[PDB]
Design a protein around this nucleic acid. Structure first.
Ligand SMILES: Nc1nc2c(ncn2[C@H]2C[C@H](O)[C@@H](COP(=O)(O)OP(=O)(O)OP(=O)(O)O)O2)c(=O)[nH]1
Ligand SMILES: [Ca+2]
Ligand SMILES: [Ca+2]
Ligand SMILES: [Ca+2]
Length: 341
DNA sequence: GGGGGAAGGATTCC
DNA sequence: CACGGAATCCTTCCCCC
């Protein structure tokens, strides 16, 4: 089997560079202002002109302007990027019936019934790149390997706007030389727990008794790495469907006053419903971020669908439950609707 | 003993 | 920090055969 992964380059920023070409070459930073205090907020992403100086996703906008005080800062317009993405995905379909969308800029494609041998795949990659570049003026990176995991990795390497195949012979090479940390699904928390077990390389996951390895990093994550190390990972590509829709927002200032937090909440709810399009959720969760950037949530599942009127009512209670259970001040508030019918 | 869920949270990632 | 959004796995408690 052969898998081709697609990972659009610095997406949000490039989509802005495409809508306003006068940007190209310049340092571009797509921001997410919270309204808290002037320039307060994070960075969704940035183009490579800005990335060359540390300005990346996650860091505070303020920390960015310190580095590049003259870079171009644009507010994140998720909706617009969403549509562009949609199209690009629709385009890929005409390359394989088997397609799995991992995010707003990631998709796997099983070209087993289209290509034979990697060379033909590598060419199909270029055939796709040029196609995308032409139709939407958007460069992307393509990773090719036997399974989704290695395909993604291959991509990570070729970045930006590149292509790369990982033949079975090299696959074995990575299981030993490749850093365990860089393996998809291995954040800081996990990588560290592995650093102790002594597992610094993928292959090392074979020098530990399943139980200890399992009891340390969960059963699922355990079997996961073990199959990858044994060179037997082979998850199929499938059409995933949104399991939930939500909306969150940072208040002008921390709070614990029911009436002061309500307005924000009702807005998240009001919007989350519109987002629902024509979906009817059976579960409603109220998420809250305390003064120390912590997250607590209380929800509830019903035997029937939830109406907007019901969302309002219930949402209040859950928020009340939160307050009387956490003395901390609430920095942000929002909702989450799941368990659609 | 163990299936069955629900809920609250931990983790990873875009 | 300093934002949003979302999936998956995990621990835990609760009801019952
Ligand atoms: N709002 C928000 N967006 C994020 C965050 N992290 C990543 N994103 C955005 C960046 C892109 O718009 C999209 C895809 O993430 P990548 O990790 O693919 O970012 P980018 O497009 O720069 O990929 P690239 O490194 O150029 O290959 O998700 C985040 O923490 N907050
Ligand atoms: Ca990506
Ligand atoms: Ca990307
Ligand atoms: Ca990692």
């Amino acid at each position: 089997m052969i898998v081709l992964f697609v990972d659009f380059d610095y997406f949000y920023a490039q989509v802005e560079e495409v809508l306003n070409p006068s940007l190209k070459g310049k340092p571009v930073v797509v921001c997410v202002f919270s309204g808290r205090f002037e320039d307060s907020g994070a960075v969704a992403t940035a183009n490579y002109e800005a990335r060359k100086f540390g300005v990346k996703a996650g860091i505070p906008i303020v920390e960015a302007k310190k580095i590049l005080p003259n870079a171009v800062y644009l507010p994140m317009r998720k909706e617009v990027y969403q549509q562009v993405s949609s199209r690009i995905m629709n385009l890929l379909r005409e390359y394989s019936e088997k397609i799995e969308i991992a995010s707003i800029d990631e998709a796997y494609l099983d070209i087993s019934d289209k290509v034979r041998d990697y060379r033909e795949a590598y060419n199909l990659g270029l055939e796709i790149k040029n196609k995308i570049l032409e139709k939407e003026k958007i460069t992307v990176t393509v990773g090719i390997s036997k399974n989704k995991v290695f395909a993604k990795i291959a991509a990570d390497m070729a970045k930006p706007n590149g292509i790369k195949v990982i033949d079975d012979e090299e696959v074995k090479r990575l299981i030993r030389e490749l850093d365990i940390a860089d393996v998809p699904g291995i954040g800081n928390i996990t990588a560290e727990k592995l650093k102790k077990l002594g597992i610094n390389k993928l292959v090392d996951t074979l020098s530990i008794e399943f139980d200890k390895l399992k009891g340390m990093i969960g059963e699922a994550k355990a079997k996961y790495l073990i199959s990858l190390a044994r060179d037997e990972y082979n998850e199929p590509i499938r059409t995933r469907v949104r399991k939930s829709i939500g909306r969150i927002v940072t208040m002008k200032r921390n709070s614990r006053n029911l009436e002061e937090i309500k307005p924000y909440l009702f807005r998240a709810i009001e919007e989350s419903y519109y987002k629902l399009d024509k979906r009817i959720p059976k579960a409603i969760h109220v998420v809250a971020v305390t003064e120390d950037l912590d997250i607590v949530s209380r929800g509830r599942t019903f035997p029937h669908g939830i109406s907007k009127e019901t969302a309002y009512s219930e949402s209040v209670k859950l928020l009340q439950k939160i307050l009387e259970e956490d003395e901390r001040k609430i920095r942000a508030i929002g909702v989450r609707f799941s368990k659609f019918i």
